[PDB]
């Protein structure tokens, strides 16, 4: 269908735009005493978690648009 192909192209472009990798920050005995690291670890943590979630969801959307996998309730809602 038309909407399936349009969403496939949009999701492919979005995957191209969004980067793929983000490594968490390492805990150290003297690093915890630094509030900069205390904030900075939280930033990289949230960034990596949300990036992984978004990448997985968009990959599932692309997979559905190609028909390889079935639609679920959450997947249907995200498509909508």
């Amino acid at each position: 269908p038309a909407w399936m192909r349009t969403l496939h192209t949009t999701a492919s472009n979005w995957l191209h735009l969004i980067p793929q990798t983000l490594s968490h920050l390492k805990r150290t005995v003297e690093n915890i005493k630094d509030p900069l690291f205390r904030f900075f670890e939280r930033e990289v943590k949230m960034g990596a978690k949300l990036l992984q979630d978004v990448r997985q969801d968009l990959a599932d959307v692309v997979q559905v648009c190609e028909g390889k996998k079935k639609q679920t309730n959450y997947l249907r809602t995200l498509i909508n």
Partner: protein
């Protein structure tokens, strides 16, 4: 022989025990000493039970049995006698002391006279023989007590009007409930029973002081103990009426407070205008007067001094005596500060704290005045401050004091507030006072809004206490309707009290609009009373409230506080907002509060501590990881400061004790200077905040503490006694205990944190994922505290979301305005009353369940400092100091910041409950508790020893569980679900070993056989528990992983996976294929509902289900529709003759009421000494409640399912709550089995992780092509034995069927249409149709068989299709499949496109030509027109096809239709036409505008009676337009799926149905007399006779919605898509 000795002791005690009797005004001799009898009976029962433990109990068993019997009779008799005695006592004082009730209410006056005569007769009989058994052996004594209680309750419930008149007589009675107001009125003579009712009637009066005669009221008292002595005592002898002397006490309280204030002001004038103050004299003055009076005297003195100083420099150029005022304030503040640095009595300490706060505010104000160079008394920089003016020359004492702010003037109400916690007068509080006073002067309300915990309600209460007013806090909600608020407003108007309606926006918008009227009228009355032209002689302004004229007192006001933007809040209409002066409270001055609080508690470094603690709180808010349960607002800081003060006091006491025990040298100054205040603050902060933190935030917060508080460390105390009690309790409950870093250190540390939080807060929240040990933690803590402190601890576990909020808190009848207690309200009221000594015990109310603002916001006042449960009827319940409110939740994703900030939090992570602890608990329970109820123990211990190496850290089980978390499961995988499945399967293995031993008495199982069997079954159980809820691929993957890591010998088979193998009792692997024989089904049993062709999946799932059900363990089968879940479960249940299955069919609107109706029908409640037990009516049988759509029920906006929570409560806790009388009901011989589609299917919701913890899930997927080939080849071979010539075609026929069904499933999916579901149900229907067509026929060539096959394929796969291209595809694919699998056949004869089969033209089901069928239908239509309905119809081919389909459906048992098509297409007419042919009687419900659910229930009852009792075939035609409510669809769902509605016939309607069914069975010739067999026969008759034809429009979203609200419409109803005319 100690058993006989103690039995003789108990015999002597009971024979010597007599009933203590005391007179009642020379009328009766009441029972006294209830507690002694109660605990005597309790101790005797416990002793007899402990004797039952002993083995020598057998020789005295029968005697001790009769002893427990009579002891239970004594308990039952006196569990009602005390209540009856109290009810008669306070009812007598109403029907005797009051004379107006005789004329007003004569009928129940005479009724009470008769009941009192009966009670005095029984009571004189008791007085004659005061022996306990002589009372007990009285004939019908228990029944007499029960009927007396019933009659007294009936009389009590009919006294509402008299109570309303009594409330009108004394205005303060409006805030007293019906029970308590009757208690007060009846017990007026006995004033000692009114002491516990004064706290709900006055601000700070908790009790009154009486002389020895109890006839003269000398004074009043507060909850702390502060006393006010009346100058003129009030005598109750002169004023016998309760209301009269209560009013006199109130007026005397006001006058004596005024006079004492005058004396205190005159005395404190010396302390003012004085350079130096002697500490002794000031302390004496403080101790002489009350806290409010000394604070008021200080305020008056300071205000007068400042006014005099300002008047002195009115000339501008004069001197500055304001510096003298500042110096005096500073000197007094220094004297106060030195006073608190040493030990003080608690009352004097609170007085000093209040004075220090007030004087700090005075110093700040005076400094501000000096800085601004204020020199005129009329300057607004001074007029804006709250100034107190005292006029001793005023004759009226109540008007001697005037409080002014800006242009507003108020009079002190002189209401005794007791000792209330004063708040620091921060600039925000000053702004609040200014705005609220400006609103009050303009005769408006107050609307302080903002986020939670910014000092809004407390600010309103503090302002009210500042003016000496009575402030009432009403926790508003959605049931505060127009009438309840009108009554509350009437009470406030008559009393003259302030009403602080916090959470005002929780009302409905319509209710707020309605209340705006009353608010406007009250404000107008206040405004007219404000005008000076009004005089005392002129009648007070009378506002009209609730169609009544109510006097309006000047002192009253309406304050509403609300949080804007929070969840579960409405909007205020503009006509209501214009009546209130709103104020924004967003940023309280936390630093000033902290500094002044630390200064008043005695901290020398208060400023530094506050400046270090407030930025610390901001750092915590902005630096720790964001979580839903984290709160760092003003409430958290308040708790921290209070805990710091308590810790400082305890440290001072400990130092003093160390000094007295070690020598004799104590100096208050030495201790004060040498005290680590920083350490105290850190200890309080850690005790309050560390428990709520996640694992990764603890080191972050500790580093933060080291950064802001360097050099100070926290050393948590070692509660050695509590740790010993925890160790003992864990040992008795088979729990793993560990100190520090041992196995279980984190859990016990969490328990200690929970204890510390309970010591501080009265509201707790144990937040953490399922299976983190919260329940065990708080249970172990409760038992340890009970066994340590010696105070019995009881717990009331309430599932808040398993019941409606009306059932949880209570309901108010809109008609009669009577209050019915909810669950939590009933529990709290029972604890408060303490009729059975509940106030001396540790009461914990645990709200185990999900939390949302709808139900938890009603507890805001309870969790606040108010500790009041405000009810819509104006009642308020004070939380006793021994009651704790606990919330055991898994997440806090839906609660607002109001609830999170109100409760201390303890966060339990899943790392708290390590897997080794669960393994140790399982092993201990296995080694201790017998499974039968000993060879059982020996087998259990041997097996546990065998499984010990695997149930270890980094063992086979742990590694397998870790890997199983990485696979894909149909339902979300939780550790505890897998562990519970494994433990249940291992228990079943132990029972299998025991059964093997029983079957072989001569040769029991040896050690080696046990080892082999246990190891192999452990691997088997791990495989089937960690991957039972996954596809075959994941099962094979887990099997391969186990084969790698495991060392135990596993099947040597090359490609066959391990899951294809069972563990025989001999201790060897045997493939499941050995239990799958090539059976030959009987010809007449082809595709029968109870016929199951054995396959590999069938036998595996049958064994698994038998294993799980033999443990009575709840389980859920999840899989696609038609996979075989119900069939497999019924096959497994057929191997258990002692289990009866009852079918439940959940829908989107399913509520626990369905389960309650099923319990009412199939079970019965019986009263037992341990409580109510619900058991099935049949004896020795286990009721298996089979819920077919367990995950379908609607999920609210807060992610909960009420029926799912109900099932979770009934599974985990083993019972539920009867909402009729709030009685705990324990389930007996009842287990639950669930069925559901995968949660990814539309309309299905994922089950809560707390529910999935208890229920194993087995994934029953579609049978494979090989399995389908086997099953339906067997079915065809059995079926094709009718025609011997056709026997050779069974193999190609089943192949063709399987191929076409596989193609149909792939081509049409649920993505296209909601009803496009295909399952082996279609194949079963195919085989049934072919067999039914072939049954009467004697011979038939292959072409006829292919024609029948094609016709059945068309009727199954093409009837439900929507588009034309899909039907064309189905026809073409049928043709291609038949030609592919059946070559060398003549296509034209067997596959002529108009495939029509009908039995109208012959006795058998044979093909019919189109034209002959059309002519026959024309003739039948002519007859139909002449007989039933004269509406001409035009006949075409589609009409013939449709009538053939309807005739096909109507001839089947339980054949229901779902006709989907545009209106006017003839669906109803064709249904009536076919039904008239087939003899069915057409029934249609006549829906009108007033048609409700009860009329539908009556129509259903009539149709079921006709279809089951009279054996009359009925075609119940029902249209979608006939659906008005969801109840219609729910009852239709139940009737379609089961054939009987459980709650439809009840009471009289049930008995008449029983009689009619008996008559019907007599007519059929059956011999049935029991209700169960007759009801089963009725259900069978309804199934056989009732057909439901459902017609609806082809809506797109409507079909999807109906696929969820009524799932049975798509599972039991054959779907025909008539559509529009082509």
């Amino acid at each position: 022989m100690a058993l006989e000795e103690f039995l003789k002791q108990i015999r002597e005690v009971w024979n010597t025990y007599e009933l203590d009797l005391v007179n009642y005004q020379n009328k009766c001799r009441l029972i006294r000493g209830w507690d002694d009898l109660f605990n005597k009976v309790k101790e005797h029962i416990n002793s007899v039970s402990a004797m039952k433990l002993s083995p020598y109990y057998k020789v005295f068993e029968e005697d001790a049995l009769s002893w427990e019997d009579k002891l239970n009779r004594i308990m039952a008799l006196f569990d009602v006698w005390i209540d009856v005695q109290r009810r008669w006592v306070y009812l007598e004082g109403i029907f005797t002391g009051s004379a107006d009730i005789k004329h007003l209410l004569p009928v129940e006056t005479q009724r009470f006279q008769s009941i009192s005569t009966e009670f005095l007769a029984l009571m004189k009989k008791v007085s004659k023989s005061p022996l306990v058994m002589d009372v007990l052996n009285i004939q019908g004594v228990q029944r007499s007590l029960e009927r007396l209680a019933d009659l007294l309750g009936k009389i009590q419930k009919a006294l509402g009007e008299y109570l309303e008149r009594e409330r009108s007589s004394f205005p303060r009675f409006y805030f007293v409930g019906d029970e308590d107001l009757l208690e007060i009125i009846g017990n007026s003579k006995n004033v000692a029973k009114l002491q516990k009712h004064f706290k709900k009637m006055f601000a700070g009066v908790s009790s009154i002081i009486l002389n020895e005669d109890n006839s003269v009221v000398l004074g009043i008292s507060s909850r702390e103990g502060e006393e006010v002595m009346f100058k003129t005592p009030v005598s109750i002898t002169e004023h016998p009426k309760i209301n009269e002397w209560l009013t006199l006490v109130e007026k005397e309280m006001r006058v004596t407070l005024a006079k004492l204030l005058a004396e205190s002001v005159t005395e404190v004038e010396i302390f003012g205008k004085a350079t130096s103050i002697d500490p002794n004299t000031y302390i004496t003055w403080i101790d002489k007067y009350q806290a409010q009076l000394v604070v008021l005297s200080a305020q008056i003195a300071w205000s007068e001094n400042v006014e005099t100083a300002l008047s002195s420099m009115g000339g501008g150029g004069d001197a500055a005596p304001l510096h003298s005022v500042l110096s005096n304030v500073e000197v007094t503040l220094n004297v106060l500060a030195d006073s608190v640095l040493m030990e003080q009595p608690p009352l004097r300490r609170r007085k000093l704290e209040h004075l220090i706060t007030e004087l700090v505010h005075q110093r700040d104000v005076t400094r501000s005045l000096i800085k601004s160079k204020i020199d005129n008394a009329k300057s607004f920089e001074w007029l804006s401050q709250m100034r107190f003016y005292f006029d001793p020359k005023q004759t009226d004492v109540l008007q001697q004091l005037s409080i002014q702010m800006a242009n507003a003037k108020f009079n002190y109400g002189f209401e005794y507030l007791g000792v209330q916690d004063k708040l620091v007068q921060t600039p925000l509080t000053d702004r609040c006072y200014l705005t609220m006073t400006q609103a009050l002067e303009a005769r408006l309300g107050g609307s302080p809004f903002g986020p939670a915990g910014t000092g809004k309600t407390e600010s309103v209460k503090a302002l009210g206490h500042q003016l000496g007013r009575f402030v009432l806090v009403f926790n508003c909600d959605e049931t505060f309707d127009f009438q309840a608020m009108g009554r509350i407003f009437v009470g406030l108007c008559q009393v003259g009290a302030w009403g602080c309606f916090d959470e005002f926006n929780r009302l409905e918008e319509r209710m707020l609009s309605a209340v705006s009227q009353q608010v406007q009228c009250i404000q107008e009355a206040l405004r007219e009373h404000s005008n000076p032209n009004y005089d005392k002689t002129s009648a007070p302004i009378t506002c009209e409230l609730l169609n009544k004229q109510v006097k309006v007192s000047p002192d009253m006001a309406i304050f509403i506080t609300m949080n804007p933007g929070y969840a579960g809040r409405s909007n205020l209409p503009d006509n209501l907002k214009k009546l209130f002066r709103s104020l924004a409270m967003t940023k309280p001055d936390r630093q000033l509060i902290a500094q002044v609080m630390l200064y008043s508690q005695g901290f020398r470094t208060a400023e530094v501590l506050a400046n270090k603690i407030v930025p610390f709180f901001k750092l915590c808010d902005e630096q720790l990881s964001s979580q839903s349960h984290y709160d760092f607002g003003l409430r958290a800081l308040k708790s921290v400061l209070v805990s710091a003060g308590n810790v400082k006091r305890e440290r001072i006491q400990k130092i003093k004790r160390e000094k007295e025990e070690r020598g004799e040298a104590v100096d208050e100054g030495e201790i004060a200077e040498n005290l680590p205040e920083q350490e105290i603050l850190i200890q309080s902060v850690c005790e309050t905040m560390v428990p709520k933190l996640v694992a990764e935030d603890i080191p972050l917060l500790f580093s933060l503490l080291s950064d802001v508080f360097p050099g100070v460390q926290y050393h948590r105390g070692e509660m050695t006694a509590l740790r010993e009690e925890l160790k003992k309790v864990c040992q008795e409950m088979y729990l793993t205990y560990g100190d520090g870093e041992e196995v279980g250190g984190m859990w016990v540390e969490k328990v200690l944190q929970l204890y510390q939080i309970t010591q501080i807060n009265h509201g707790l929240m144990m937040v953490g994922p399922s299976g983190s040990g919260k329940s065990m933690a708080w249970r172990v803590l409760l038992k340890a505290l009970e066994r340590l402190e010696g105070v019995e601890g009881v717990a009331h576990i309430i599932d808040p979301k398993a019941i409606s909020k009306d059932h949880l808190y209570g309901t108010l009848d809109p008609n009669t305005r009577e209050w019915t207690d909810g669950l939590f309200t009933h529990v709290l009221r029972k604890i408060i009353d303490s009729v059975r000594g509940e106030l001396q015990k540790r009461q914990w109310i645990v709200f185990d369940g999900d939390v949302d603002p709808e139900w938890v916001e009603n507890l805001n006042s309870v969790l606040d400092d108010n500790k009041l449960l405000t009810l819509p009827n104006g009642e308020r319940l004070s939380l006793p100091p021994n009651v704790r409110i606990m919330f055991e939740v898994q997440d806090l994703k839906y609660a607002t910041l109001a609830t999170v900030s109100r409760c201390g939090m303890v966060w339990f992570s899943e790392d708290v409950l390590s897997t080794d602890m669960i393994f140790n608990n399982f092993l201990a329970r296995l080694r201790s508790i017998p499974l039968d109820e000993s060879p059982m123990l020996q087998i259990q211990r041997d097996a546990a020893t065998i499984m010990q190496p695997y149930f270890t850290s980094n063992g086979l089980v742990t590694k397998a569980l870790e890997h199983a978390f990485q696979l894909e499961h149909i339902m979300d995988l939780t550790r505890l679900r897998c562990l519970g499945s494994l433990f249940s399967m291992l228990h079943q293995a132990c029972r299998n070993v025991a059964q093997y031993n029983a079957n072989h008495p001569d040769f029991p199982m040896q050690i080696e056989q046990l080892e082999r069997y246990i190891q192999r079954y452990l691997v088997y159980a791990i495989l089937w528990s960690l991957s039972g809820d996954s596809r075959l691929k994941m099962r094979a993957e887990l099997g391969e992983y186990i084969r790698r890591i495991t060392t135990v010998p596993l099947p040597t088979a090359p490609n066959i996976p391990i899951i294809d193998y069972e563990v025989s009792i001999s201790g060897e692997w045997s493939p499941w294929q050995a239990k799958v024989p090539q059976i030959e089904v009987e010809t007449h049993k082809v595709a029968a509902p109870d016929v199951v062709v054995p396959t590999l999946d069938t036998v595996r799932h049958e064994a698994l289900l038998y294993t799980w059900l033999a443990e009575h363990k709840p389980l859920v089968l999840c899989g696609p529709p038609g996979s075989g879940k119900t069939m497999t479960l019924f096959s497994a249940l057929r191997a258990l003759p002692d289990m009866e299955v009852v079918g439940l069919n959940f829908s989107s609107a399913t509520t626990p009421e369905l389960l309650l109706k099923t319990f009412d029908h199939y079970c019965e409640y019986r009263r037992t000494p341990n409580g109510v037990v619900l058991a099935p009516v049949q004896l020795g049988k286990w009721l298996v409640l089979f819920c077919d759509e367990i995950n379908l029920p609607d999920m609210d906006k807060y992610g909960t399912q009420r029926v799912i929570s109900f099932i979770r409560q009934m599974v985990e806790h083993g019972g539920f709550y009867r909402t009729s009388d709030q009685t705990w009901v324990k389930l007996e011989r009842i287990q639950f089995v669930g069925a559901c589609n995968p949660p990814t299917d539309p309309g299905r919701k994922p089950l809560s992780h707390r529910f999935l913890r208890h229920v194993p899930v087995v994934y029953v997927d579609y049978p494979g092509p090989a399995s389908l080939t086997q099953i339906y080849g067997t079915f065809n071979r059995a079926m094709l034995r009718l025609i011997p010539s056709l026997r050779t075609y069974a193999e190609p026929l089943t192949a063709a069927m399987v191929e076409f069904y596989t193609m149909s499933q792939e081509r049409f999916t649920q993505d296209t249409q909601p009803h496009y579901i295909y399952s082996p149900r279609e194949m079963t229907r195919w085989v049934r149709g072919i067999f039914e067509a072939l049954r009467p026929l004697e011979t038939l060539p292959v072409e006829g068989l292919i024609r029948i096959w094609a016709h059945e394929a068309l009727r199954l796969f093409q009837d439900r299709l929507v588009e034309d291209e899909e039907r064309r595809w189905t026809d073409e694919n049928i043709d291609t499949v038949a030609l592919k699998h059946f070559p060398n056949i003549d296509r034209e004869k067997a596959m002529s496109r108009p495939i029509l089969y009908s039995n109208w033209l012959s006795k058998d089901y044979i093909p019919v030509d189109q034209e002959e069928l059309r002519d026959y239908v024309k003739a039948r239509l002519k007859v139909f027109y002449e007989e039933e309905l004269d509406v001409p119809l035009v006949l075409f081919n589609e009409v013939l096809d449709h009538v053939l389909r309807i005739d096909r459906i109507f001839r089947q048992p339980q054949g229901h239709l779902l006709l989907i098509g545009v209106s006017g297409a003839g669906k109803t007419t064709l249904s009536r036409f076919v039904a008239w042919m087939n003899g069915l009687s057409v029934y249609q419900i006549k829906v009108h505008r007033k048609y409700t659910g009860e009329d539908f229930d009556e129509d259903l009852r009539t149709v079921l009676r006709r279809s089951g009792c009279k054996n009359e075939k009925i075609a119940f035609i029902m249209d979608e337009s006939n659906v008005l409510d969801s109840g219609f669809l729910e009852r239709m769902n139940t009737l379609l799926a089961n054939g009987e509605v459980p709650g439809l016939f009840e009471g009289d309607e049930y008995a008449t149905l029983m009689t009619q069914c008996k008559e019907g069975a007599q007519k059929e010739g059956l011999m049935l007399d029991s209700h169960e067999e007759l009801y089963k026969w009725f259900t069978s008759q309804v199934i056989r006779n009732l057909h439901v034809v459902f017609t609806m429009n082809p809506s797109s979203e409507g079909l999807k919605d109906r696929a969820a609200t009524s799932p049975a419409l798509f599972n039991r109803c054959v779907l025909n898509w008539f559509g529009d005319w082509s």
